[PDB]
Design a binder for these strands. Structure first.
Ligand SMILES: [K+]
Ligand SMILES: [K+]
Ligand SMILES: [K+]
Ligand SMILES: [K+]
Ligand SMILES: [K+]
Ligand SMILES: [K+]
Ligand SMILES: [K+]
Ligand SMILES: [K+]
Ligand SMILES: [K+]
Ligand SMILES: [K+]
Ligand SMILES: [K+]
Ligand SMILES: [Mg+2]
Ligand SMILES: [Mg+2]
Ligand SMILES: [Mg+2]
Ligand SMILES: [Mg+2]
Ligand SMILES: [Mg+2]
Ligand SMILES: [Mg+2]
Ligand SMILES: [Mg+2]
Ligand SMILES: [Mg+2]
Ligand SMILES: [Mg+2]
Ligand SMILES: [Mg+2]
Ligand SMILES: [Mg+2]
Ligand SMILES: [Mg+2]
Ligand SMILES: [Mg+2]
Ligand SMILES: [Mg+2]
Ligand SMILES: [Mg+2]
Ligand SMILES: [Mg+2]
Ligand SMILES: [Mg+2]
Ligand SMILES: [Mg+2]
Ligand SMILES: [Mg+2]
Ligand SMILES: [Mg+2]
Ligand SMILES: [Mg+2]
Ligand SMILES: [Mg+2]
Ligand SMILES: [Mg+2]
Ligand SMILES: [Mg+2]
Ligand SMILES: [Mg+2]
Ligand SMILES: [Mg+2]
Ligand SMILES: [Mg+2]
Ligand SMILES: [Mg+2]
Ligand SMILES: [Mg+2]
Ligand SMILES: [Mg+2]
Ligand SMILES: [Mg+2]
Ligand SMILES: [Mg+2]
Ligand SMILES: [Mg+2]
Ligand SMILES: [Mg+2]
Ligand SMILES: [Mg+2]
Ligand SMILES: [Mg+2]
Ligand SMILES: [Mg+2]
Ligand SMILES: [Mg+2]
Ligand SMILES: [Mg+2]
Ligand SMILES: [Mg+2]
Ligand SMILES: [Mg+2]
Ligand SMILES: [Mg+2]
Ligand SMILES: [Mg+2]
Ligand SMILES: [Mg+2]
Ligand SMILES: [Mg+2]
Ligand SMILES: [Mg+2]
Ligand SMILES: [Mg+2]
Ligand SMILES: [Mg+2]
Ligand SMILES: [Mg+2]
Ligand SMILES: [Mg+2]
Ligand SMILES: [Mg+2]
Ligand SMILES: [Mg+2]
Ligand SMILES: [Zn+2]
Lengths: 116, 127, 103, 86, 50
RNA sequence: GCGACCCCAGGUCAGGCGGGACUACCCGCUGAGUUUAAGCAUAUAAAUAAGCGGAGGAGAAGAAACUUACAAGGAUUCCCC
RNA sequence: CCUGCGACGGACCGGGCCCAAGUCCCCUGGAAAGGGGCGCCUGGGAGGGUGAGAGCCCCGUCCGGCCCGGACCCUGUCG
RNA sequence: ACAGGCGAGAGACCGAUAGCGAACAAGUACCGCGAGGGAAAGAUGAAAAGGACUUUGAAAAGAGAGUCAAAAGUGCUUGA
RNA sequence: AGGAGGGCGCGGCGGCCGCUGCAAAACCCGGGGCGCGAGCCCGGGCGGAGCGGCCGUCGGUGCAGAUCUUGGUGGUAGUAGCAAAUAUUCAAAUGAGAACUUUGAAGGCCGAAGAGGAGAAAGGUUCCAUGUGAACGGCACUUGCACAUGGGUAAGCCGAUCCUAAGGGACGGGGUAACCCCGGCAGAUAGCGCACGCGCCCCGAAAGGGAAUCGGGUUAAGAUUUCCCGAGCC
RNA sequence: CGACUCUCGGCAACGGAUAUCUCGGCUCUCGCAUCGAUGAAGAACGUAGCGAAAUGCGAUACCUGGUGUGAAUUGCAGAAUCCGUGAACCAUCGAGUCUUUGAACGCAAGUUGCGCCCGAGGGGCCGAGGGCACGCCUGCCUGGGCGUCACG
C-alpha cells in the first residue's frame, strides 16, 4: 500500500510488513475454503501488496549491490544485451589503425574543394 | 486529399483500428460536442465524454431529454444518461445506451485536468 | 511441327518458372537511387556530384577505335607532367590509374 | 487371424512421451524420438515436409525471451537509468 | 495401471480438469461466440495416447 | 643432489571463448530419377530436388601471373547489349 | 614545400500536444446521415464511426506550429 | 539479392464450396505405433427491448398475451 | 468434322446518363408482352439497402453429362431386419408413465481349468454419493460404465528404487565432408585403505536375485499388510 | 361417390442456394537488422472471487515497478480511487520476478530415481541457499620421463 511509503521504510520494517501480509493472505485462504462474500476480494488486494513489498526490497538490494561493486561485476549485474552485441569490439578497438595508415591521414586527408 | 505516406486510407485497416482500440483511445473516439453556450465560453468545439457530465440528447427518439452521465461503457461505445430508461417485458428498468456523438455537453465536470485540457484545445481554436 | 515455320528453339526445359525476374520495383529503384544521390550531394556540399575528374581514352578494338570516352584514372606520368603529386590527386578530386600507360 | 484376432494383442508400447517435444514418439527400444530425434543435439527436421516444419517453429509456441527483443532494440538496449520522477 | 509414473499421473490430472462445461457467465459476455467446450473427451471414446 | 630446458600430465585453479535455433536472400559440400529424345544406353532433366554443414544485414567477389591485336583498354558487383 | 581540445546550430531517426466549417426550418421515416429551404469551411470533398447516400455530429485529413528524446558520425560558424 | 523476422503502404485480386489448410479457442477437433494426415464451423435486432403474466400439460411444449418498425424468437438478414 | 461473320448474357476498370426507404439487389408467380433465337421489357408479391443502361477497354466470363467435386434430397421402405449363450412368474412399493427400477416369494442357469473371488499389461476417474432438461444406453426406463455437482487413493516393513542377464549407450582413440559409424583397440583410466600402502563408466527385470509385519477393527467410496487397537521387526 | 397413382395451383415444411456484407486471405512495393551457456527456439506444469479453451503471465504467476494519460473495468459480485502521488481487461518502457525442462551441463531417465562438495543461520546435528559436464585459449599451481644438458 502506497509504494511511496514503502520506499521510505527501512529493511527491518519492510520485512515486518512482508511477514504481516503473508499471515493475512493465509487467513483469507482459510476463509475462502470455508465461507465469505467480501473477504474474497481482499485476496487480490493483499496478493498484490506482497508483490509490491518484494519488488521494493529487491530494487533496493540491486541498487545497493550496484553501488558496492562500482571491480569485476557479478554475472547477474552485468550489462545484458544480445549475445552478439557483447562479443563486439570496442570503439577503441574498431578505430585502431597502424602507423602507415595513420600517417596517410595526417599528410593526405580528403580535402574540401569546389569547381568554379 | 490525404498526403501523408504514413496514414492509411484502407477501409479494412481503418475499421480494424477503430474496433480493436484500447480503452485510452476509445476515450478520444467517444467525444461529444459542446453546447452553444459552452463553446462560446471556452472557445472549444468538442470534448471527450466523462462520468458526471450533464448532457442533452439531440438525436434519436430521446432527442431533447437531459440528464447526467452515469456510465461510460467504452466496450460498447455507448454512454448511459440518468433516467433515460426503458421497461422490460417483466417490468424492470434498463438504462438505454446512446452514442456520445449524438449528444451535446451542457455542464462540464472539471477537476484539474479538464481545465488543463480545455486550455490546450482553446489555444489552437483561438489562434 | 506442321507447317513452314522456323525450327523452334525454346530454352524452357528446366524449372524456368522458379527463376522469373519481374521489374515491378523499377520505379522504386529509380527513387531509391535518386534519394541516395541527394544524400551523397549533401554529404559533400561543395564537391562536385559527378565524382572525381576522369581522363580521355580511345575505346579499344577496331569497331570502337575512333571513339573517345572517360577512362578510369590518370596515369602516373600524366600527373607528374602536370605537377600534381600522385598522393595528392585523389584527395583533391582526381582519379589515379597506375595500370594504364602512355604509348 | 491376421485381422480382428491379431488386433487383440496390442499390449506393449513402441513409443512413449518424449522429454524434449512431448509427442508420443519416443521409441523405447531405440531410445530415440521419431519426431524430434531427442537424444541428438540438433532437432530432426526435413525439407521434404514443409508442413512438418511449419507445425513446429518460432511462433508456434510462446517466445518467453524473444517477443521482447524488438522492444529492446527500439530503445537501443538502453538497460541503464529510469524515467525521471514526476 | 495402478502402477503409475509420476509424469503420467500429472498429465492425467490436467486432462481431468480440462473436460468440464464452460461457465455459464462466459456466454453472457459482450462479444461472445463460444457455445460449448469443443474439447470434451469421454474416456470410452477418443483415447489419449500416452 | 642441486639446477636449466624440452615434451607431456592433472586441476570445481584466475579470467574467458564454443556447441543450439531460424529460411526468403547468401557461402561450402554431396547428389538422383520422373521427363525429352515419339524406343534407348551418351545426351537431357541438372552441375536441379532431396541430403550434410556455415554466416550476415546483406553475403560472396574484389585491386590483374586481366584483356586484347586496337589510335589500345585497366579491381569487384549488378543491369542492357 | 605540407603535417589538439572544446561551445553553439544544422542535417538524420523516434515520440507527444494543439491545429475549419449547421447538428438551423419543413416533410417521411423506429432512427435523417434521405428530399425540400436557408447557410458556412475548404492548402482540409483521403478514410472511418455514429439508429439509411454525413465536407460542416465525432475521430481524423490539409497547412503548420510547439515541446520531449535518441544517434557520437558528418558538417556549419566561434574560441 | 531477399516466398524468413519486426514495422509500414497500396491493389482493375477473392468474397465464406471463393481467398492461405485455417475470416471462428486452426495446424485446432479427430485419425495413425510412428514418420505423418488433417477438417467443418462467419451475418437476430438501432437497442436484448432475449418474450412478464394467465391457462393446459409429468415435462418438452402449446394457446393467449407482452417487446419491436418488424418476430427478425439466441445456427435467429434474405431464404432458390 | 471444320471455318468465319453478326448478335445475346456475366464480372470489373475509364467515361457518360440515370434509379432507389413514395422501397434497390436477390427470390416467387395458371400475370402481360417484344425478339427466329441467345435473351429482354413490364405487372403483382416478398424483401429491406443498394442497383442499372449506353460508349470504350479488360477477364478466373455462359454446363446435362466427365463411374466429374462438395453439399443437400428421393424411391427402395415403415421394408430387410432386432432369432447363439435353457427362463421366467406372482404380490407389493415408487412414479405422469413399469414386461425392463427396488423389496419379498417362487422356478431355473453358471457348477468351482465358473457366468465366483483377486492380479500383471492397457485404460484413466469408468470408483462413491446426490440429482436429472435434452442426447446416448440400435424396444423401453423412474433408470446409468450417460449427464451435472461434490467426495475419494495415507507405507521405515507392499512395490519401484539396489544388483546384474541377453543387450544398449558411451570417455580416449580410429573412420567419416558432415550427420554419424565403431568397445577392446589399452590411453598418465581420472581412484581406494590407513606421509605410507594398494591399483588386473553408466543404463538394462513392478515374473530373475533381494533389509525388515502380524492378528483383530474401521468407510458411501481404503487399507486383499498404508488408517485405528494391540503386538513385533529391520 | 370414394381410395390409389399422376398432375396444376395456394399455404406450410425440408434444405441452405442467391443477393448484400467482411477486424480474413492473396499479390505488389517500401523501411529496418535485433536469438542463444548472462541458457535461446521448442516442450511441460501451474496461475483469476467466480475459467475449460484461446490470450497473458511464472510461487511477485490474466500480474509487481517506472513513466504517460487522466476516471474507469464490466457477464455477475465485492473492493479501491476522483481539484488526485490518481481508476483503467489503458498506453509505453529503462526497474524487478521469472516453476520443471530443453544445445542442457553431477549421473540418469516409461525413475520427480542415484551421488559428491561448500555453506549462511541455529564438536556434532539440523540448515536457508548454492555448486560439481565437455572441448578450447592465456596465465598459474602441483607433477612425470636420463628426452637435451650443466655443475657436483
Ligand atoms: K507459318
Ligand atoms: K524485381
Ligand atoms: K462521414
Ligand atoms: K478448407
Ligand atoms: K427479417
Ligand atoms: K463492360
Ligand atoms: K518405501
Ligand atoms: K525386481
Ligand atoms: K403441390
Ligand atoms: K453470398
Ligand atoms: K538407475
Ligand atoms: Mg525440368
Ligand atoms: Mg499382414
Ligand atoms: Mg519393440
Ligand atoms: Mg535404450
Ligand atoms: Mg475402447
Ligand atoms: Mg576456474
Ligand atoms: Mg550453429
Ligand atoms: Mg523416351
Ligand atoms: Mg513417350
Ligand atoms: Mg521407356
Ligand atoms: Mg537443396
Ligand atoms: Mg542475426
Ligand atoms: Mg565480405
Ligand atoms: Mg598489385
Ligand atoms: Mg571486365
Ligand atoms: Mg477538427
Ligand atoms: Mg440540405
Ligand atoms: Mg436499414
Ligand atoms: Mg521481409
Ligand atoms: Mg475455407
Ligand atoms: Mg457465393
Ligand atoms: Mg492420435
Ligand atoms: Mg487403430
Ligand atoms: Mg439491416
Ligand atoms: Mg431467416
Ligand atoms: Mg409454380
Ligand atoms: Mg449487371
Ligand atoms: Mg477476376
Ligand atoms: Mg472457368
Ligand atoms: Mg451442374
Ligand atoms: Mg454437353
Ligand atoms: Mg455417377
Ligand atoms: Mg456428393
Ligand atoms: Mg436412399
Ligand atoms: Mg419385418
Ligand atoms: Mg439374425
Ligand atoms: Mg429381460
Ligand atoms: Mg449345462
Ligand atoms: Mg446345473
Ligand atoms: Mg471386484
Ligand atoms: Mg457406479
Ligand atoms: Mg432407445
Ligand atoms: Mg461422466
Ligand atoms: Mg519390500
Ligand atoms: Mg552398478
Ligand atoms: Mg553384458
Ligand atoms: Mg568419438
Ligand atoms: Mg538398474
Ligand atoms: Mg522380484
Ligand atoms: Mg477396495
Ligand atoms: Mg487475457
Ligand atoms: Mg538434463
Ligand atoms: Zn521428441
Amino acid at each position: 500500500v502506497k509504494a511511496g511509503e514503502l520506499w521510505n521504510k527501512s529493511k527491518d520494517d519492510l520485512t515486518k510488513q512482508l511477514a504481516e501480509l503473508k499471515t493475512e493472505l493465509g487467513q483469507l485462504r482459510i476463509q475462502k475454503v470455508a465461507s465469505s462474500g467480501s473477504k474474497l476480494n481482499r485476496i487480490h488486494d493483499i496478493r498484490k501488496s506482497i508483490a509490491r513489498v518484494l519488488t521494493v526490497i529487491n530494487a533496493k538490494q540491486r541498487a545497493q549491490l550496484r553501488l558496492f561493486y562500482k571491480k569485476y561485476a557479478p554475472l547477474d549485474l552485468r550489462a545484458k544485451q544480445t549475445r552478439a552485441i557483447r562479443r563486439r569490439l570496442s570503439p577503441d578497438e574498431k578505430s585502431r589503425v597502424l602507423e602507415k595508415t595513420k600517417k596517410r591521414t595526417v599528410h593526405f586527408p580528403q580535402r574540401k574543394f569546389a569547381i568554379k | 486529399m490525404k498526403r501523408n505516406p504514413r496514414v492509411t486510407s484502407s477501409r479494412r485497416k481503418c475499421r480494424k483500428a477503430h474496433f480493436t482500440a484500447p480503452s485510452s483511445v476509445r476515450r478520444v473516439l467517444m467525444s461529444a460536442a459542446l453546447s452553444s453556450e459552452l463553446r462560446h465560453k471556452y472557445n472549444v468545439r468538442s470534448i471527450p465524454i466523462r462520468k458526471d457530465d450533464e448532457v442533452q440528447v439531440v438525436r434519436g427518439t430521446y432527442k431533447g431529454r437531459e440528464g447526467k452521465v452515469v456510465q461510460v461503457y467504452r466496450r460498447r461505445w455507448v454512454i448511459h444518461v440518468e433516467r433515460i430508461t426503458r421497461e422490460k417485458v417483466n417490468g424492470s428498468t434498463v438504462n438505454v445506451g446512446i452514442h456520445p456523438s449524438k449528444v451535446i455537453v451542457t455542464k462540464l465536470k472539471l477537476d484539474k485536468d479538464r481545465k488543463a485540457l480545455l486550455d490546450r484545445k482553446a489555444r489552437g481554436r483561438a489562434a | 511441327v506442321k507447317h513452314n515455320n522456323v525450327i523452334p528453339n525454346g530454352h524452357f526445359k528446366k524449372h524456368w518458372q522458379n527463376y522469373v525476374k519481374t521489374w515491378f520495383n523499377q520505379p522504386a529503384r529509380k527513387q531509391r537511387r535518386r534519394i541516395a544521390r541527394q544524400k551523397n550531394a549533401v554529404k559533400i556540399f561543395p564537391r562536385p556530384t559527378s565524382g572525381p575528374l576522369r581522363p580521355i581514352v580511345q575505346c579499344q578494338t577496331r569497331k570502337y577505335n575512333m571513339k573517345a570516352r572517360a577512362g578510369r584514372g590518370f596515369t602516373l606520368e600524366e600527373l607528374k607532367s602536370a605537377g600534381i603529386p600522385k598522393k595528392l590527386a585523389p584527395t583533391i578530386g582526381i582519379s589515379v590509374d597506375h595500370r594504364r600507360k602512355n604509348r | 487371424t491376421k485381422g480382428t484376432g491379431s488386433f487383440g494383442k496390442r499390449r506393449n508400447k513402441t513409443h512413449t512421451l518424449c522429454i524434449r517435444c512431448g509427442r508420443r514418439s519416443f521409441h523405447l527400444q531405440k531410445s530415440t524420438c521419431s519426431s524430434c530425434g531427442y537424444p541428438a543435439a540438433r532437432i530432426r527436421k526435413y525439407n521434404w515436409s514443409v508442413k512438418a516444419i511449419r507445425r513446429k517453429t518460432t511462433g508456434t509456441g510462446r517466445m518467453r525471451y524473444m517477443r521482447h527483443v524488438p522492444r529492446r532494440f527500439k530503445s537501443n538496449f538502453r538497460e541503464g537509468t529510469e524515467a525521471a520522477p514526476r | 495401471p495402478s502402477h503409475k509414473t509420476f509424469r503420467i499421473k500429472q498429465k492425467l490430472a490436467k486432462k481431468q480438469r480440462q473436460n468440464r462445461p464452460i461457465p455459464y457467465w462466459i456466454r453472457m459476455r459482450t462479444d461472445n461466440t463460444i457455445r460449448y467446450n469443443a474439447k470434451r473427451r469421454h474416456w470410452r471414446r477418443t483415447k489419449l495416447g500416452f
